[PDB]
Amino acid sequence: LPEDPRWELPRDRLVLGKPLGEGQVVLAEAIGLDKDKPNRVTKVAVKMLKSDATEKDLSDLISEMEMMKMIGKHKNIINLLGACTQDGPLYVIVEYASKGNLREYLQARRPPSYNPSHNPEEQLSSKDLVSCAYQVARGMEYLASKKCIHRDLAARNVLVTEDNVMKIADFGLPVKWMAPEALFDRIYTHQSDVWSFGVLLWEIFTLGGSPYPGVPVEELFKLLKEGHRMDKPSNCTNELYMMMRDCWHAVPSQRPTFKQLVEDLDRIVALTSNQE
Ligand SMILES: COc1cc(OC)c(Cl)c(N2Cc3cnc(NC4CCCCC4)nc3N([C@H]3CCN(C(=O)/C=C/CN(C)C)C3)C2=O)c1Cl
C-alpha cells in the first residue's frame, strides 16, 4: 500500500489496548501524535481488518480512510488522526469516544421506560438533550456541506467523548431510520438524512427509545405511505415534536435542511434553561 506522509505514524508509536467492538476497533495510546508534543500520549481508537478478512474488507477499509482524508475536520464528527500502512497490517487511527454511542449513553441515564444498565449514570437536563440534538445537527450540516450523504444516521451512529461532545460515526461507508423514498427506491439524499435525523430526535427525547415499537418491518412502509408517524414522546415540547414531523415530510423537498435545523436548535437551546 502506498505511503502517505501527511497521515503516517510509525507503528511503534501506537500501544494497542483493549477491544472496543467489531473490521474491529481497539483502544490505543498514541505517543507524539502531535509532533510539537512528542512525549505526550493521546488515547485513540484504531481500526484494523478482522482475523478471517477478505479482499473486499481490505479495500473498503482503505476507501473509508481515503474518504475521511477528503472530508476534513469538524468537531462533531469522528475525525481521522493517522494511519500505520507500512511496517505490517493496516491501522486507521481516529478520535476516541469514551462514553459510548448516543443510544447507550442516553439509556444509561434513564431514571432507575426501563434502564438495562447495572451501572446507571446521572440525569440529563432538558437543555442537555436539546444541545445534544444541536451538536448532531452541526455534524450533519458539515457533512452535507462536503456533499457527504450518511445513509444510516441514528443515535447508535453518534458517539460521545469524555467531554460530552457528540460526534457523527460511520459517515463514509435500520429500516426504521430510512426515509420512505430510500426504503422503496434506494434513493438516498441529504433530504433522506434529514428524515433519519427526525427519528434521531425522537430517540433523544425517549432517552434511547426503540422507534415504532411493535411494528413489524414488512408493515412499516405501507403504514408510512398512509401517513403514519410516531407519537410525541411523553416528555418532549410541542415545538421539538413539530421539528420531528417536519423532518418526516413525505415530500423530501419540503423537509428542512440541516442548515435550518442547526439555526432552529440554536434558538431553542438558548431559550431552554439549565433548570427546566
Ligand atoms: C476508520 O475508523 C473509524 C471510523 C469511524 O467513523 C468514520 C468510526 Cl465511528 C470509528 N469508531 C471510532 C470509535 C471511537 N470511540 C469508540 N468508543 C467506544 C464506544 C462504544 C463503547 C466503548 C468505547 N468507538 C469507536 N468505534 C466503534 C467501536 C464500537 N462502537 C460502538 O458504538 C459499540 C456498541 C456496542 N455496545 C454494546 C458497547 C463504536 C468506531 O467504530 C472508527 Cl475506528
PDB file of C-alpha atoms and ligand atoms in Angstrom:
ATOM      1  CA  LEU A   1       0.000   0.000   0.000  1.00  0.00           C
ATOM      2  CA  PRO A   2       1.350   3.452  -0.937  1.00  0.00           C
ATOM      3  CA  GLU A   3       2.610   5.593   1.956  1.00  0.00           C
ATOM      4  CA  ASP A   4       1.061   8.970   2.694  1.00  0.00           C
ATOM      5  CA  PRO A   5       3.330  11.201   4.796  1.00  0.00           C
ATOM      6  CA  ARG A   6       0.514  13.593   5.782  1.00  0.00           C
ATOM      7  CA  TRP A   7      -1.074  10.875   7.985  1.00  0.00           C
ATOM      8  CA  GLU A   8       1.592   8.169   8.575  1.00  0.00           C
ATOM      9  CA  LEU A   9       2.572   7.482  12.155  1.00  0.00           C
ATOM     10  CA  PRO A  10       5.330   4.972  12.900  1.00  0.00           C
ATOM     11  CA  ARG A  11       3.897   1.705  14.123  1.00  0.00           C
ATOM     12  CA  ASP A  12       5.951   1.653  17.325  1.00  0.00           C
ATOM     13  CA  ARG A  13       4.259   4.961  18.425  1.00  0.00           C
ATOM     14  CA  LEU A  14       0.971   3.134  18.950  1.00  0.00           C
ATOM     15  CA  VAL A  15       0.351   0.970  22.038  1.00  0.00           C
ATOM     16  CA  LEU A  16      -2.555  -1.354  21.271  1.00  0.00           C
ATOM     17  CA  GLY A  17      -5.091  -1.602  24.104  1.00  0.00           C
ATOM     18  CA  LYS A  18      -8.405  -3.363  24.711  1.00  0.00           C
ATOM     19  CA  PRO A  19     -11.171  -4.294  22.246  1.00  0.00           C
ATOM     20  CA  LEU A  20     -13.839  -1.634  21.743  1.00  0.00           C
ATOM     21  CA  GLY A  21     -16.120  -3.677  19.440  1.00  0.00           C
ATOM     22  CA  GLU A  22     -16.442  -5.258  15.986  1.00  0.00           C
ATOM     23  CA  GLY A  23     -13.157  -4.917  10.859  1.00  0.00           C
ATOM     24  CA  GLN A  24     -12.502  -4.349  14.574  1.00  0.00           C
ATOM     25  CA  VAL A  25     -11.757  -1.406  16.810  1.00  0.00           C
ATOM     26  CA  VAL A  26      -9.311  -1.278  19.705  1.00  0.00           C
ATOM     27  CA  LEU A  27      -8.475   1.478  22.136  1.00  0.00           C
ATOM     28  CA  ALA A  28      -4.858   2.563  21.928  1.00  0.00           C
ATOM     29  CA  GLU A  29      -2.400   5.143  23.082  1.00  0.00           C
ATOM     30  CA  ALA A  30      -0.529   7.259  20.541  1.00  0.00           C
ATOM     31  CA  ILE A  31       2.847   8.660  21.550  1.00  0.00           C
ATOM     32  CA  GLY A  32       3.745  12.012  19.989  1.00  0.00           C
ATOM     33  CA  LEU A  33       0.741  12.148  17.671  1.00  0.00           C
ATOM     34  CA  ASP A  34       1.162  15.920  17.889  1.00  0.00           C
ATOM     35  CA  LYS A  35       4.743  16.373  16.559  1.00  0.00           C
ATOM     36  CA  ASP A  36       5.060  19.546  18.707  1.00  0.00           C
ATOM     37  CA  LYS A  37       4.499  17.453  21.886  1.00  0.00           C
ATOM     38  CA  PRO A  38       6.485  14.257  21.164  1.00  0.00           C
ATOM     39  CA  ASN A  39       6.363  12.894  24.771  1.00  0.00           C
ATOM     40  CA  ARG A  40       2.554  13.161  25.100  1.00  0.00           C
ATOM     41  CA  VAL A  41       0.286  10.128  24.958  1.00  0.00           C
ATOM     42  CA  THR A  42      -3.205  10.510  23.478  1.00  0.00           C
ATOM     43  CA  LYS A  43      -5.953   7.917  23.711  1.00  0.00           C
ATOM     44  CA  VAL A  44      -7.202   6.936  20.253  1.00  0.00           C
ATOM     45  CA  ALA A  45      -9.343   4.361  18.511  1.00  0.00           C
ATOM     46  CA  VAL A  46      -7.824   2.081  15.919  1.00  0.00           C
ATOM     47  CA  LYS A  47      -9.473   0.065  13.163  1.00  0.00           C
ATOM     48  CA  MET A  48      -7.844  -2.956  11.509  1.00  0.00           C
ATOM     49  CA  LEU A  49      -9.008  -5.946   9.460  1.00  0.00           C
ATOM     50  CA  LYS A  50     -10.559  -8.945  11.277  1.00  0.00           C
ATOM     51  CA  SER A  51      -8.914 -12.393  11.541  1.00  0.00           C
ATOM     52  CA  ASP A  52     -10.816 -14.036   8.661  1.00  0.00           C
ATOM     53  CA  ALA A  53     -10.978 -10.936   6.431  1.00  0.00           C
ATOM     54  CA  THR A  54     -11.413 -10.721   2.645  1.00  0.00           C
ATOM     55  CA  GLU A  55     -10.090  -8.509  -0.164  1.00  0.00           C
ATOM     56  CA  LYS A  56     -13.398  -6.576  -0.103  1.00  0.00           C
ATOM     57  CA  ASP A  57     -12.947  -5.902   3.607  1.00  0.00           C
ATOM     58  CA  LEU A  58      -9.449  -4.503   2.920  1.00  0.00           C
ATOM     59  CA  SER A  59     -10.337  -2.073   0.108  1.00  0.00           C
ATOM     60  CA  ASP A  60     -13.459  -0.828   1.962  1.00  0.00           C
ATOM     61  CA  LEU A  61     -11.223  -0.017   4.937  1.00  0.00           C
ATOM     62  CA  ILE A  62      -8.913   1.885   2.602  1.00  0.00           C
ATOM     63  CA  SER A  63     -11.823   3.642   0.849  1.00  0.00           C
ATOM     64  CA  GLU A  64     -13.178   4.685   4.269  1.00  0.00           C
ATOM     65  CA  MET A  65      -9.755   6.044   5.206  1.00  0.00           C
ATOM     66  CA  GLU A  66      -9.230   7.900   1.892  1.00  0.00           C
ATOM     67  CA  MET A  67     -12.770   9.303   2.152  1.00  0.00           C
ATOM     68  CA  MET A  68     -12.026  10.510   5.712  1.00  0.00           C
ATOM     69  CA  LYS A  69      -8.923  12.335   4.424  1.00  0.00           C
ATOM     70  CA  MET A  70     -11.056  14.278   1.891  1.00  0.00           C
ATOM     71  CA  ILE A  71     -13.936  15.241   4.233  1.00  0.00           C
ATOM     72  CA  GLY A  72     -11.743  17.263   6.561  1.00  0.00           C
ATOM     73  CA  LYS A  73     -12.074  18.116  10.231  1.00  0.00           C
ATOM     74  CA  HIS A  74     -15.113  19.076  12.234  1.00  0.00           C
ATOM     75  CA  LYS A  75     -15.518  18.861  15.964  1.00  0.00           C
ATOM     76  CA  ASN A  76     -18.855  16.966  15.707  1.00  0.00           C
ATOM     77  CA  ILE A  77     -17.619  14.104  13.555  1.00  0.00           C
ATOM     78  CA  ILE A  78     -15.207  11.256  14.329  1.00  0.00           C
ATOM     79  CA  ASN A  79     -12.041  12.647  12.753  1.00  0.00           C
ATOM     80  CA  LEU A  80      -9.080  10.828  11.167  1.00  0.00           C
ATOM     81  CA  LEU A  81      -5.832  11.220  13.121  1.00  0.00           C
ATOM     82  CA  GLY A  82      -3.370   8.983  11.267  1.00  0.00           C
ATOM     83  CA  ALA A  83      -2.560   5.532   9.938  1.00  0.00           C
ATOM     84  CA  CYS A  84       0.047   2.791  10.027  1.00  0.00           C
ATOM     85  CA  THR A  85       0.258   1.488   6.469  1.00  0.00           C
ATOM     86  CA  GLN A  86       3.855   0.315   6.009  1.00  0.00           C
ATOM     87  CA  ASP A  87       5.570  -1.947   8.535  1.00  0.00           C
ATOM     88  CA  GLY A  88       2.668  -4.503   8.635  1.00  0.00           C
ATOM     89  CA  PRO A  89      -1.167  -4.608   8.764  1.00  0.00           C
ATOM     90  CA  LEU A  90      -3.290  -1.537   8.073  1.00  0.00           C
ATOM     91  CA  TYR A  91      -4.234   0.560  11.114  1.00  0.00           C
ATOM     92  CA  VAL A  92      -6.582   3.544  10.829  1.00  0.00           C
ATOM     93  CA  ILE A  93      -6.353   5.934  13.765  1.00  0.00           C
ATOM     94  CA  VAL A  94      -9.402   8.042  14.666  1.00  0.00           C
ATOM     95  CA  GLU A  95     -10.581  10.027  17.670  1.00  0.00           C
ATOM     96  CA  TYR A  96     -11.732   8.005  20.747  1.00  0.00           C
ATOM     97  CA  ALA A  97     -15.203   8.404  22.321  1.00  0.00           C
ATOM     98  CA  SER A  98     -15.102   7.050  25.913  1.00  0.00           C
ATOM     99  CA  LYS A  99     -18.765   7.405  26.809  1.00  0.00           C
ATOM    100  CA  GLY A 100     -20.266   5.183  24.130  1.00  0.00           C
ATOM    101  CA  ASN A 101     -22.803   5.694  21.372  1.00  0.00           C
ATOM    102  CA  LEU A 102     -25.645   8.110  21.978  1.00  0.00           C
ATOM    103  CA  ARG A 103     -28.285   5.389  22.231  1.00  0.00           C
ATOM    104  CA  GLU A 104     -26.430   3.661  25.102  1.00  0.00           C
ATOM    105  CA  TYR A 105     -25.320   6.909  26.669  1.00  0.00           C
ATOM    106  CA  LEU A 106     -28.961   8.029  26.885  1.00  0.00           C
ATOM    107  CA  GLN A 107     -30.400   4.709  28.042  1.00  0.00           C
ATOM    108  CA  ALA A 108     -27.830   4.509  30.827  1.00  0.00           C
ATOM    109  CA  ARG A 109     -29.112   7.892  32.021  1.00  0.00           C
ATOM    110  CA  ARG A 110     -32.789   6.886  32.350  1.00  0.00           C
ATOM    111  CA  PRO A 111     -34.373   7.282  35.809  1.00  0.00           C
ATOM    112  CA  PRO A 112     -33.952   3.970  37.715  1.00  0.00           C
ATOM    113  CA  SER A 113     -39.207   3.193  30.373  1.00  0.00           C
ATOM    114  CA  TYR A 114     -36.602   0.702  31.679  1.00  0.00           C
ATOM    115  CA  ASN A 115     -32.853   1.103  32.472  1.00  0.00           C
ATOM    116  CA  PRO A 116     -30.976  -2.041  31.283  1.00  0.00           C
ATOM    117  CA  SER A 117     -27.654  -0.974  32.865  1.00  0.00           C
ATOM    118  CA  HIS A 118     -26.485  -2.245  36.271  1.00  0.00           C
ATOM    119  CA  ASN A 119     -24.176   0.815  36.165  1.00  0.00           C
ATOM    120  CA  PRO A 120     -26.635   3.759  35.741  1.00  0.00           C
ATOM    121  CA  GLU A 121     -25.488   7.380  35.285  1.00  0.00           C
ATOM    122  CA  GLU A 122     -26.635  10.904  36.202  1.00  0.00           C
ATOM    123  CA  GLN A 123     -29.806  12.505  34.802  1.00  0.00           C
ATOM    124  CA  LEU A 124     -29.578  14.765  31.747  1.00  0.00           C
ATOM    125  CA  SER A 125     -31.301  18.170  31.802  1.00  0.00           C
ATOM    126  CA  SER A 126     -33.727  19.333  29.123  1.00  0.00           C
ATOM    127  CA  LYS A 127     -31.065  21.771  27.944  1.00  0.00           C
ATOM    128  CA  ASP A 128     -28.554  18.912  27.661  1.00  0.00           C
ATOM    129  CA  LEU A 129     -30.920  16.987  25.400  1.00  0.00           C
ATOM    130  CA  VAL A 130     -31.560  19.905  23.054  1.00  0.00           C
ATOM    131  CA  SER A 131     -27.822  20.676  22.998  1.00  0.00           C
ATOM    132  CA  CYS A 132     -27.123  17.025  22.072  1.00  0.00           C
ATOM    133  CA  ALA A 133     -29.520  17.395  19.146  1.00  0.00           C
ATOM    134  CA  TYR A 134     -27.897  20.702  18.139  1.00  0.00           C
ATOM    135  CA  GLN A 135     -24.414  19.155  18.089  1.00  0.00           C
ATOM    136  CA  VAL A 136     -25.589  16.186  15.986  1.00  0.00           C
ATOM    137  CA  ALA A 137     -27.202  18.638  13.530  1.00  0.00           C
ATOM    138  CA  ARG A 138     -23.935  20.598  13.364  1.00  0.00           C
ATOM    139  CA  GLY A 139     -22.152  17.377  12.484  1.00  0.00           C
ATOM    140  CA  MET A 140     -24.558  16.625   9.664  1.00  0.00           C
ATOM    141  CA  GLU A 141     -24.624  20.190   8.405  1.00  0.00           C
ATOM    142  CA  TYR A 142     -20.855  19.995   7.948  1.00  0.00           C
ATOM    143  CA  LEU A 143     -21.039  16.561   6.298  1.00  0.00           C
ATOM    144  CA  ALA A 144     -23.835  17.822   3.994  1.00  0.00           C
ATOM    145  CA  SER A 145     -21.738  20.888   3.040  1.00  0.00           C
ATOM    146  CA  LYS A 146     -18.961  18.462   1.907  1.00  0.00           C
ATOM    147  CA  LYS A 147     -21.503  16.617  -0.142  1.00  0.00           C
ATOM    148  CA  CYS A 148     -21.395  13.561   2.092  1.00  0.00           C
ATOM    149  CA  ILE A 149     -24.676  11.616   2.419  1.00  0.00           C
ATOM    150  CA  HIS A 150     -24.657   9.415   5.513  1.00  0.00           C
ATOM    151  CA  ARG A 151     -27.466   6.855   4.781  1.00  0.00           C
ATOM    152  CA  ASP A 152     -27.675   5.350   8.285  1.00  0.00           C
ATOM    153  CA  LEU A 153     -27.948   8.288  10.665  1.00  0.00           C
ATOM    154  CA  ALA A 154     -29.161   7.155  14.061  1.00  0.00           C
ATOM    155  CA  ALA A 155     -28.257   7.528  17.756  1.00  0.00           C
ATOM    156  CA  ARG A 156     -26.162   4.354  17.581  1.00  0.00           C
ATOM    157  CA  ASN A 157     -24.010   6.175  14.942  1.00  0.00           C
ATOM    158  CA  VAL A 158     -23.326   9.109  17.167  1.00  0.00           C
ATOM    159  CA  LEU A 159     -20.511   8.815  19.703  1.00  0.00           C
ATOM    160  CA  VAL A 160     -19.907  10.750  22.892  1.00  0.00           C
ATOM    161  CA  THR A 161     -16.450  11.832  24.089  1.00  0.00           C
ATOM    162  CA  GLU A 162     -15.217  12.064  27.686  1.00  0.00           C
ATOM    163  CA  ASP A 163     -16.145  15.776  27.377  1.00  0.00           C
ATOM    164  CA  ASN A 164     -19.718  15.062  26.204  1.00  0.00           C
ATOM    165  CA  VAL A 165     -19.031  16.222  22.647  1.00  0.00           C
ATOM    166  CA  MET A 166     -21.328  14.492  20.168  1.00  0.00           C
ATOM    167  CA  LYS A 167     -19.578  13.075  17.104  1.00  0.00           C
ATOM    168  CA  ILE A 168     -21.098  11.554  13.961  1.00  0.00           C
ATOM    169  CA  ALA A 169     -19.913   7.999  13.338  1.00  0.00           C
ATOM    170  CA  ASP A 170     -19.531   5.790  10.234  1.00  0.00           C
ATOM    171  CA  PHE A 171     -20.216   8.609   7.800  1.00  0.00           C
ATOM    172  CA  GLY A 172     -18.073   7.193   4.967  1.00  0.00           C
ATOM    173  CA  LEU A 173     -19.333   3.728   4.028  1.00  0.00           C
ATOM    174  CA  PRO A 174     -32.153   0.180  10.349  1.00  0.00           C
ATOM    175  CA  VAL A 175     -35.141   0.313   8.012  1.00  0.00           C
ATOM    176  CA  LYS A 176     -36.873   2.268  10.819  1.00  0.00           C
ATOM    177  CA  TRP A 177     -34.483   5.196  10.224  1.00  0.00           C
ATOM    178  CA  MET A 178     -34.881   5.298   6.433  1.00  0.00           C
ATOM    179  CA  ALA A 179     -36.885   7.860   4.532  1.00  0.00           C
ATOM    180  CA  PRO A 180     -39.721   6.223   2.538  1.00  0.00           C
ATOM    181  CA  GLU A 181     -38.023   7.121  -0.759  1.00  0.00           C
ATOM    182  CA  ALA A 182     -34.856   5.347   0.472  1.00  0.00           C
ATOM    183  CA  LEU A 183     -36.892   2.461   1.818  1.00  0.00           C
ATOM    184  CA  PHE A 184     -38.693   1.818  -1.515  1.00  0.00           C
ATOM    185  CA  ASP A 185     -36.465   3.140  -4.307  1.00  0.00           C
ATOM    186  CA  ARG A 186     -32.996   3.017  -2.679  1.00  0.00           C
ATOM    187  CA  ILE A 187     -32.755   6.818  -3.287  1.00  0.00           C
ATOM    188  CA  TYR A 188     -30.560   8.377  -0.596  1.00  0.00           C
ATOM    189  CA  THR A 189     -30.073  12.133  -0.465  1.00  0.00           C
ATOM    190  CA  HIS A 190     -29.344  14.849   2.039  1.00  0.00           C
ATOM    191  CA  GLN A 191     -33.116  15.044   2.444  1.00  0.00           C
ATOM    192  CA  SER A 192     -33.395  11.396   3.450  1.00  0.00           C
ATOM    193  CA  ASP A 193     -30.679  12.033   6.026  1.00  0.00           C
ATOM    194  CA  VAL A 194     -32.931  14.791   7.435  1.00  0.00           C
ATOM    195  CA  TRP A 195     -35.689  12.213   7.805  1.00  0.00           C
ATOM    196  CA  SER A 196     -33.254   9.970   9.696  1.00  0.00           C
ATOM    197  CA  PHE A 197     -32.405  12.892  11.973  1.00  0.00           C
ATOM    198  CA  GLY A 198     -36.059  13.282  12.954  1.00  0.00           C
ATOM    199  CA  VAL A 199     -36.059   9.690  14.100  1.00  0.00           C
ATOM    200  CA  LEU A 200     -32.790  10.508  15.907  1.00  0.00           C
ATOM    201  CA  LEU A 201     -34.534  13.457  17.618  1.00  0.00           C
ATOM    202  CA  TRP A 202     -37.252  11.068  18.776  1.00  0.00           C
ATOM    203  CA  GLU A 203     -34.534   8.766  20.235  1.00  0.00           C
ATOM    204  CA  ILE A 204     -33.045  11.698  22.087  1.00  0.00           C
ATOM    205  CA  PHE A 205     -36.333  12.586  23.806  1.00  0.00           C
ATOM    206  CA  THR A 206     -37.313   8.989  24.599  1.00  0.00           C
ATOM    207  CA  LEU A 207     -33.803   8.604  26.147  1.00  0.00           C
ATOM    208  CA  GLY A 208     -32.922   5.895  23.650  1.00  0.00           C
ATOM    209  CA  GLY A 209     -36.383   4.594  22.812  1.00  0.00           C
ATOM    210  CA  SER A 210     -36.835   1.981  20.115  1.00  0.00           C
ATOM    211  CA  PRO A 211     -38.737   3.524  17.178  1.00  0.00           C
ATOM    212  CA  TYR A 212     -42.105   2.194  16.008  1.00  0.00           C
ATOM    213  CA  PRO A 213     -42.188  -0.272  18.902  1.00  0.00           C
ATOM    214  CA  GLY A 214     -44.051  -3.442  17.930  1.00  0.00           C
ATOM    215  CA  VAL A 215     -44.463  -2.511  14.268  1.00  0.00           C
ATOM    216  CA  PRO A 216     -43.137  -5.286  12.014  1.00  0.00           C
ATOM    217  CA  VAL A 217     -40.743  -4.241   9.248  1.00  0.00           C
ATOM    218  CA  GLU A 218     -42.950  -5.623   6.446  1.00  0.00           C
ATOM    219  CA  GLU A 219     -45.883  -3.439   7.558  1.00  0.00           C
ATOM    220  CA  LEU A 220     -43.872  -0.239   8.092  1.00  0.00           C
ATOM    221  CA  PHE A 221     -43.511   1.172   4.530  1.00  0.00           C
ATOM    222  CA  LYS A 222     -47.280   0.859   3.978  1.00  0.00           C
ATOM    223  CA  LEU A 223     -48.061   2.484   7.320  1.00  0.00           C
ATOM    224  CA  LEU A 224     -45.639   5.239   6.314  1.00  0.00           C
ATOM    225  CA  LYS A 225     -47.286   5.830   2.890  1.00  0.00           C
ATOM    226  CA  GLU A 226     -50.643   6.060   4.689  1.00  0.00           C
ATOM    227  CA  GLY A 227     -49.146   8.923   6.763  1.00  0.00           C
ATOM    228  CA  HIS A 228     -48.325   7.012   9.941  1.00  0.00           C
ATOM    229  CA  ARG A 229     -45.920   8.997  12.153  1.00  0.00           C
ATOM    230  CA  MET A 230     -44.530   8.298  15.606  1.00  0.00           C
ATOM    231  CA  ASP A 231     -46.398   9.854  18.526  1.00  0.00           C
ATOM    232  CA  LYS A 232     -44.826  12.595  20.522  1.00  0.00           C
ATOM    233  CA  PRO A 233     -42.668  11.230  23.342  1.00  0.00           C
ATOM    234  CA  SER A 234     -44.263  11.733  26.746  1.00  0.00           C
ATOM    235  CA  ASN A 235     -41.581  14.267  27.788  1.00  0.00           C
ATOM    236  CA  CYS A 236     -40.943  16.492  24.769  1.00  0.00           C
ATOM    237  CA  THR A 237     -42.097  20.016  23.876  1.00  0.00           C
ATOM    238  CA  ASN A 238     -44.648  20.602  21.093  1.00  0.00           C
ATOM    239  CA  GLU A 239     -42.004  22.683  19.292  1.00  0.00           C
ATOM    240  CA  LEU A 240     -39.496  19.847  19.118  1.00  0.00           C
ATOM    241  CA  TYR A 241     -42.225  17.442  18.096  1.00  0.00           C
ATOM    242  CA  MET A 242     -43.041  19.740  15.173  1.00  0.00           C
ATOM    243  CA  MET A 243     -39.409  19.580  14.118  1.00  0.00           C
ATOM    244  CA  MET A 244     -39.569  15.783  14.075  1.00  0.00           C
ATOM    245  CA  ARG A 245     -42.732  15.968  11.991  1.00  0.00           C
ATOM    246  CA  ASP A 246     -41.141  18.468   9.568  1.00  0.00           C
ATOM    247  CA  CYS A 247     -38.161  16.134   9.182  1.00  0.00           C
ATOM    248  CA  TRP A 248     -40.707  13.457   8.325  1.00  0.00           C
ATOM    249  CA  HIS A 249     -42.420  15.292   5.486  1.00  0.00           C
ATOM    250  CA  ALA A 250     -43.457  12.858   2.810  1.00  0.00           C
ATOM    251  CA  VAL A 251     -42.173  15.272   0.234  1.00  0.00           C
ATOM    252  CA  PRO A 252     -38.360  15.386   0.521  1.00  0.00           C
ATOM    253  CA  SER A 253     -38.198  18.950  -0.868  1.00  0.00           C
ATOM    254  CA  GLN A 254     -40.428  20.184   1.948  1.00  0.00           C
ATOM    255  CA  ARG A 255     -38.233  18.907   4.807  1.00  0.00           C
ATOM    256  CA  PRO A 256     -35.979  21.454   6.487  1.00  0.00           C
ATOM    257  CA  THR A 257     -32.262  21.366   5.680  1.00  0.00           C
ATOM    258  CA  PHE A 258     -29.583  20.703   8.296  1.00  0.00           C
ATOM    259  CA  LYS A 259     -28.530  24.345   7.924  1.00  0.00           C
ATOM    260  CA  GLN A 260     -32.004  25.429   9.066  1.00  0.00           C
ATOM    261  CA  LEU A 261     -32.247  22.786  11.783  1.00  0.00           C
ATOM    262  CA  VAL A 262     -28.991  23.987  13.273  1.00  0.00           C
ATOM    263  CA  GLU A 263     -30.370  27.560  13.364  1.00  0.00           C
ATOM    264  CA  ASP A 264     -33.679  26.431  14.905  1.00  0.00           C
ATOM    265  CA  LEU A 265     -31.944  24.251  17.541  1.00  0.00           C
ATOM    266  CA  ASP A 266     -29.551  27.059  18.354  1.00  0.00           C
ATOM    267  CA  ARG A 267     -32.545  29.274  19.226  1.00  0.00           C
ATOM    268  CA  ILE A 268     -34.277  26.549  21.265  1.00  0.00           C
ATOM    269  CA  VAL A 269     -31.090  25.774  23.261  1.00  0.00           C
ATOM    270  CA  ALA A 270     -30.671  29.459  24.199  1.00  0.00           C
ATOM    271  CA  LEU A 271     -34.367  29.566  25.223  1.00  0.00           C
ATOM    272  CA  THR A 272     -34.193  26.409  27.391  1.00  0.00           C
ATOM    273  CA  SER A 273     -32.848  26.925  30.936  1.00  0.00           C
ATOM    274  CA  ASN A 274     -30.403  24.577  32.721  1.00  0.00           C
ATOM    275  CA  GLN A 275     -33.097  24.003  35.391  1.00  0.00           C
ATOM    276  CA  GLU A 276     -36.327  23.226  33.477  1.00  0.00           C
TER     277      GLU A 276
HETATM  278  C1  LIG B   1     -11.807   4.289  10.386  1.00  0.00           C
HETATM  279  O1  LIG B   1     -12.093   4.037  11.777  1.00  0.00           O
HETATM  280  C2  LIG B   1     -13.284   4.522  12.266  1.00  0.00           C
HETATM  281  C3  LIG B   1     -14.196   5.336  11.564  1.00  0.00           C
HETATM  282  C4  LIG B   1     -15.381   5.759  12.201  1.00  0.00           C
HETATM  283  O2  LIG B   1     -16.360   6.551  11.654  1.00  0.00           O
HETATM  284  C5  LIG B   1     -15.991   7.269  10.463  1.00  0.00           C
HETATM  285  C6  LIG B   1     -15.647   5.361  13.500  1.00  0.00           C
HETATM  286 CL1  LIG B   1     -17.079   5.832  14.263  1.00  0.00          CL
HETATM  287  C7  LIG B   1     -14.749   4.556  14.181  1.00  0.00           C
HETATM  288  N1  LIG B   1     -15.071   4.246  15.544  1.00  0.00           N
HETATM  289  C8  LIG B   1     -14.332   5.076  16.495  1.00  0.00           C
HETATM  290  C9  LIG B   1     -14.688   4.821  17.804  1.00  0.00           C
HETATM  291  C10 LIG B   1     -14.276   5.733  18.761  1.00  0.00           C
HETATM  292  N2  LIG B   1     -14.610   5.532  20.079  1.00  0.00           N
HETATM  293  C11 LIG B   1     -15.334   4.460  20.412  1.00  0.00           C
HETATM  294  N3  LIG B   1     -15.648   4.275  21.805  1.00  0.00           N
HETATM  295  C12 LIG B   1     -16.376   3.065  22.202  1.00  0.00           C
HETATM  296  C13 LIG B   1     -17.761   3.418  22.215  1.00  0.00           C
HETATM  297  C14 LIG B   1     -18.539   2.129  22.461  1.00  0.00           C
HETATM  298  C15 LIG B   1     -18.353   1.767  23.958  1.00  0.00           C
HETATM  299  C16 LIG B   1     -16.865   1.711  24.365  1.00  0.00           C
HETATM  300  C17 LIG B   1     -15.976   2.760  23.673  1.00  0.00           C
HETATM  301  N4  LIG B   1     -15.721   3.575  19.475  1.00  0.00           N
HETATM  302  C18 LIG B   1     -15.443   3.715  18.169  1.00  0.00           C
HETATM  303  N5  LIG B   1     -15.819   2.781  17.231  1.00  0.00           N
HETATM  304  C19 LIG B   1     -16.990   1.896  17.470  1.00  0.00           C
HETATM  305  C20 LIG B   1     -16.496   0.775  18.352  1.00  0.00           C
HETATM  306  C21 LIG B   1     -17.714   0.198  18.953  1.00  0.00           C
HETATM  307  N6  LIG B   1     -18.747   1.268  18.855  1.00  0.00           N
HETATM  308  C22 LIG B   1     -19.963   1.155  19.426  1.00  0.00           C
HETATM  309  O3  LIG B   1     -20.808   2.050  19.383  1.00  0.00           O
HETATM  310  C23 LIG B   1     -20.233  -0.202  20.135  1.00  0.00           C
HETATM  311  C24 LIG B   1     -21.553  -0.540  20.830  1.00  0.00           C
HETATM  312  C25 LIG B   1     -21.708  -1.920  21.451  1.00  0.00           C
HETATM  313  N7  LIG B   1     -22.128  -1.722  22.853  1.00  0.00           N
HETATM  314  C26 LIG B   1     -22.909  -2.875  23.344  1.00  0.00           C
HETATM  315  C27 LIG B   1     -20.970  -1.489  23.737  1.00  0.00           C
HETATM  316  C28 LIG B   1     -18.171   2.487  18.186  1.00  0.00           C
HETATM  317  C29 LIG B   1     -15.687   3.127  15.930  1.00  0.00           C
HETATM  318  O4  LIG B   1     -16.072   2.355  15.058  1.00  0.00           O
HETATM  319  C30 LIG B   1     -13.561   4.141  13.573  1.00  0.00           C
HETATM  320 CL2  LIG B   1     -12.424   3.150  14.410  1.00  0.00          CL
END
